[PDB]
């Protein structure tokens, strides 16, 4: 199950957008009041919510459990869910596949850099938690589930062997404990093949992560429309403020410049309003992912069709661009 939790967070400089280094334009902006203070306030409030959405999903555990070196817990093979320390990616093998399927404005790219800027006022800010911190929270949730279970989240983590943990979760769905122990060879093999079929789908085909791609594509259309409105005339002589100053006397130059201001200042107000509406939809999905992590990874759900189809046994998070991926292990009778 694929759930987006956060949105790309942006900022706009009015004077680069509305005027573009024109001094006569800059003076006429003062007659409108402090519009740029309220546009900066609304966009910065959206950006802080995007960091709050990411903390509430992943940062639900207080202790960072070290990845165990034994990854074959009684027949159940977890090497594609935990990070392999031999390969320097600090991600599991499924996260490497997820980070390669989801894949104009100012942006500073690199690692600790190339901080490049554009002639519009548009820029994209980096988030608080980097990708390497997200993958460390996910590896603590997996290795905590593999060795402690419920008590990992609702208290101090209790050591339990893995097969005795599976026996309890079988007991919780109405199937008595001997069904596990007399059939560990079947259940370990069905578990190991079902992970390998997911890994195949994340190399062979596409559209499983379509909800994460939609978050990316909606942010691209919103920025590209705001850029394109710079080219509009709104009835004036030209969309270029220099050609208004060159061709016209300063009385009508003041009128034609003021005509382009309200055209550009209302395109900017439209962008802010619709980012604010879309941020309300990401909170709705990021609050649900925080509910699916506590009630389903850190526990065992009894709600039917919450946490996948079938009787829920356990569940494993994986990180993704701007989202989560939950792998739900369920029991299907036949």
């Amino acid at each position: 199950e694929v759930m987006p939790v956060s949105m790309a967070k942006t900022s706009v400089d009015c004077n680069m957008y509305i005027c573009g280094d024109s001094t006569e334009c800059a003076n006429l902006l003062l007659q409108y009041g402090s519009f740029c203070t309220q546009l900066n306030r609304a966009l910065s409030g959206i950006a802080a919510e995007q960091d709050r959405n990411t903390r509430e999903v992943f940062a639900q555990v207080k202790q960072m459990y070290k990845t165990p070196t034994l990854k074959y817990f009684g027949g159940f093979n977890f090497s594609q869910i935990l990070p392999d320390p031999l390969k320097p990616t600090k991600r599991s093998f499924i996260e490497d596949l997820l980070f390669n399927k989801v894949t104009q404005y100012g942006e500073c790219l690199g690692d600790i850099l190339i901080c490049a800027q554009k002639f519009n006022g548009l820029t994209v800010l980096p988030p608080l938690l980097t990708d390497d911190m997200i993958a460390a929270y996910t590896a603590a949730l997996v290795s905590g589930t593999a060795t402690a279970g419920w008590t990992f989240g609702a208290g101090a983590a209790l050591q339990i062997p893995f097969a005795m943990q599976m026996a309890y979760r079988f007991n919780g769905i109405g199937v008595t404990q001997n069904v596990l122990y007399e059939n560990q060879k079947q259940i370990a093999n069905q578990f190991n093949k079902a992970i390998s079929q997911i890994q195949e789908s994340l190399t062979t085909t596409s559209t499983a992560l379509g909800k994460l791609q939609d978050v990316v594509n909606q942010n691209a259309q919103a920025l590209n429309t705001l850029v394109k409105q710079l080219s509009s005339n709104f009835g004036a002589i030209s969309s270029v403020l220099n050609d208004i100053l060159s061709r016209l006397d300063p009385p009508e130059a003041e009128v034609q410049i003021d005509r382009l201001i309200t055209g550009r200042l209302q395109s900017l107000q439209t962008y802010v309003t619709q980012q604010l509406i879309r941020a309300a939809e990401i909170r709705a999905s990021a609050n649900l992912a925080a509910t699916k992590m506590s009630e389903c990874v850190l526990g065992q759900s009894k709600r039917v069709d919450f946490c996948g189809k079938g009787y829920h046994l356990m569940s494993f998070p994986q990180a993704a661009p701007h989202g989560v991926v939950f792998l739900h292990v369920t029991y299907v009778p036949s």
């Binding site: 900022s11 400089d13 004077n15 680069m16 280094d21 900066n40 306030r41 910065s44 960091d51 940062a59 555990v61 207080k62 202790q63 960072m64 459990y65 070290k66 165990p68 034994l70 817990f73 009684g74 104009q104 100012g106 500073c108 690199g110 600790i112 850099l113 901080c115 490049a116 800027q117 554009k118 002639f119 519009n120 006022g121 820029t123 800010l125 980096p126 988030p127 608080l128 938690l129 980097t130 911190m133 460390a136 929270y137 603590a140 290795s143 905590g144 060795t147 402690a148 101090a156 983590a157 209790l158 050591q159 339990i160 062997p161 005795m164 850029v227 710079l230 080219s231 220099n242």
Partner: protein, 433 residues
């Protein structure tokens, strides 16, 4: 701000032509009322109109006329008499445009012993033909210069003089037992077009103020509209780099790697010029970005292919531990190269600029931008104030503002064993809101 001190002491009789320029702040330490008057005008001659506002020990006399002005205007008080004897400001007057005389009183003109007991404070301004005169007073006990403090000044005159004041001359009093002086001092500061935030109490009395352009802390208080500010990071006004240069291809040389105001053949704007490897065709005069912006140009004199970057811009954020804890802050120049920020600060090319502000040799570049004022600590704590890309800031003992990389949680370990279980043996009841 820097004020200029003048003297009335043994051989020093300071009444020169001092420029006015915008409005002045005048203050005077007195024990013997040496400062009595001012001559305002442009040329200080009888060829135009000037005004004289003097306390002649009987009346306050305000006259705006064509005055035969003295090059040495003064009053004079005899030391063994203790009384005023001379009134030498002008000799004659004609074509008067304004006159006002206040109520009569009797003024202490004699030379006094002891220290300075009285500070009179005036502000003079020109607006719409009016001379605005503001008056304050503070009791002092000093042997020397201007004391520090805050005291409001109330208006006392709006004088419709209609004269052009560009210079002024203070009128002193000469004390002689034949000229001379006695101990007095007068101070001249200049008024500037600036922004203050004024606090008025329940009686309508101004009790406190904040100069919004003194330093980044004060600009933050003007933005929040509060004298008290809690811990956090706070977005405030954008910064720009001002260009310094002019490249025209009359014709000039080509300035590279510097924000200049360029004018190629048909292309104008501000920006940074730098060579590039875009393969123009021989019929392509200039280039464009994925938007509709010119980003490159073929040099019309030597056919070099240049880039055009924007000059620099971004937001400014002020990082504070709270005014309850300290009054030092750190600034973040968002999304900008620290080479451009540091150089334009030293060469005074930024808008906004603050007076009482310095770099401090703590410049650290994160992905969020340039962090100036905080120290880089090589350990990891809980995130206090988030900045971005894994870096937070706080106020620790080293107290000062420090910057560091976040810690995620406690570093722990669960031993895995195939036959060992942990079971709790006691419990607790906990209430959480």
């Amino acid at each position: 701000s820097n004020v200029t001190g003048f003297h009335t002491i043994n051989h020093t009789f300071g009444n020169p032509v001092i420029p006015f320029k915008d409005g002045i702040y005048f203050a005077a330490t007195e024990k013997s009322n040496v400062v009595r008057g001012w001559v305002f005008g442009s040329t200080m001659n009888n060829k135009s109109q000037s005004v004289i506002i003097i306390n002649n020990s009987t009346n306050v006399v305000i006259r705006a006329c064509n005055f035969e002005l003295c090059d040495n205007p003064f009053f004079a008080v005899s030391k063994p008499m203790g009384t005023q004897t001379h009134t030498m400001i002008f000799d004659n007057a004609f074509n008067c445009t304004f006159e006002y005389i206040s109520d009569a009183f009797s003024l202490d003109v004699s030379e006094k012993s002891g220290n300075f007991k009285h500070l009179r404070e005036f502000v003079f301004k020109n607006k719409d033909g009016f001379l605005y005169v503001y008056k304050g007073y503070q009791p002092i006990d000093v042997v020397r210069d201007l004391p520090s403090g805050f005291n409001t000044l109330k208006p006392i005159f709006k004088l419709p003089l209609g004269i052009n004041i560009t210079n002024f001359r203070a009128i002193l009093t000469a004390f002689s037992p034949i000229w001379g002086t006695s101990a007095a001092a007068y101070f001249v500061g200049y008024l500037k077009p600036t922004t203050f935030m004024l606090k008025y109490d329940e009686n309508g009395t101004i009790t406190d103020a904040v100069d919004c352009s003194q330093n980044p802390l004060a600009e933050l208080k003007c933005s929040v509209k509060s004298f008290e500010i809690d811990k956090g990071i706070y977005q405030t006004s954008n910064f720009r780099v001002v260009p310094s240069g002019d490249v025209v291809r009359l014709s000039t040389d080509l300035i590279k790697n510097q924000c200049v105001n360029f004018n190629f053949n048909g292309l104008t704007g501000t920006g940074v010029l730098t060579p590039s490897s875009k393969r123009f065709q021989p019929f392509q005069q200039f280039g464009r970005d994925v938007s509709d912006f010119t980003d490159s140009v073929r040099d019309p004199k030597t056919s070099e292919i240049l880039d055009i970057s924007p000059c620099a811009f971004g937001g400014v954020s002020v990082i504070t531990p709270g005014t309850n804890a300290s009054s030092e802050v750190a600034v973040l120049y968002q999304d900008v190269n620290c080479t451009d920020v540091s150089t334009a600060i030293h060469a005074d090319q930024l808008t906004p600029a603050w007076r009482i502000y310095s770099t401090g040799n703590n410049v650290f570049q994160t992905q969020a931008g340039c962090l100036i004022g905080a120290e880089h600590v090589d350990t990891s704590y809980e995130c206090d104030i988030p900045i971005g890309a894994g870096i937070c800031a706080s106020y620790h003992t080293v107290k000062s503002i420090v910057a560091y990389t976040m810690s995620l949680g406690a570093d722990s370990s669960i031993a895995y064993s195939n036959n060992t279980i942990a079971i709790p043996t006691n419990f607790s009841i906990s209430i959480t809101t």
